[PDB]
Amino acid sequence: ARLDKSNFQQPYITNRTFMLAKEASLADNNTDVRLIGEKLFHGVSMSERCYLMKQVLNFTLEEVLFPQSDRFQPYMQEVVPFLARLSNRLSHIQRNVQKLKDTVKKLGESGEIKAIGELDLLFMSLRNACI
């Protein structure tokens, strides 16, 4: 449904999140495929966006950040618990999320790296949708 504005008003953790995405994007050589933007919200109302980003967030935690928990330290170990708290707070949509899952899968391990590199986009979409 909703996330409080105070979750997004903390420069240290916002910056670490951006820093995590930056580091992963450095390992992402695929400039041709963007995961989060655009298509993801096609057919979804503004009021449904927060719930969509919950699903995307929980996918990313469980299938992306988990397998890659060793990478991109020390940012990973600080940022994941933050994103996990946001998930705990939130505790056709399926169609759009499945496409993102498919794309990550098609790209292989590089798709998981791509998703981590797009955490800036996930985080700011979460912010826009949920506040």
């Binding site: 997004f8 420069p11 916002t14 951006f18 930056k22 041709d32 800036d120 700011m124």
Partner: protein
């Protein structure tokens, strides 16, 4: 060996004016020209920037080419030396919303006898639809401080600090904040004096 011909290939971005910049590497060489291309993250085709082909200058203004606030971008620079040695190097992924620096706001500081009025002017940008910072960042607000320390803040444009001694000098500082993007401008500062109080008996 690209790093030997090219280094620090990066966008410098302020209030959404986005200039690609680079320097030459250690390995040479005075006989070198550069050619710039750009692309949108998530698209396939690179585009040559007209006016930045085989240049000797080390920057290229890509403001409009990177002015869609919903996209992210890359640029690349290809160096070619007169001996035929060549290198290409790409920027990191560019996100104007995240990466652009906010300039200090233009502010009007007006003196009264027992107050200072401050008017923050909206910041125009090169973003075309021209949008201001205020149009772009919905949670933008101003932080104002008057050293005498009084503080005021909000989304509104004009503020007045009351209760000041007449004929006295103060220093005001005004900064833009966008808490959600962890963004802050350097402050604009004004040193002004309250007007004299001519009151007679």
């Amino acid at each position: 060996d690209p790093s030997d011909l090219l280094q620090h290939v990066k966008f410098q971005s302020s209030n959404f004016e986005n200039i690609l910049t680079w320097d030459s590497g250690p390995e040479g060489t005075p006989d070198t020209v550069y050619s710039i291309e750009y692309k949108t993250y998530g698209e396939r085709d690179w585009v040559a920037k007209k006016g930045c082909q085989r240049i000797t200058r080390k920057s290229c203004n890509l403001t409009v080419e990177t002015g869609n606030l919903t996209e992210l971008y890359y640029a690349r620079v290809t160096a070619v030396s007169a001996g035929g040695r060549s290198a290409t190097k790409m920027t990191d992924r560019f996100s104007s919303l995240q990466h652009t620096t906010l300039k200090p706001p233009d502010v009007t500081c007006i003196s009264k006898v027992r107050s200072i009025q401050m008017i923050v002017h909206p910041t125009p940008t090169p973003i075309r639809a021209r949008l201001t910072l205020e149009d772009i960042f919905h949670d933008l607000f101003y932080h104002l401080e008057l050293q005498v320390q009084m503080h005021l803040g909000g989304k509104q444009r004009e503020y007045e600090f009351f209760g000041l001694t007449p004929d006295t000098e103060f220093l005001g500082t005004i900064m833009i904040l966008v808490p959600t993007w962890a963004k802050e401008s350097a402050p604009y500062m004004c040193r002004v004096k309250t007007l004299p109080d001519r009151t007679w008996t």
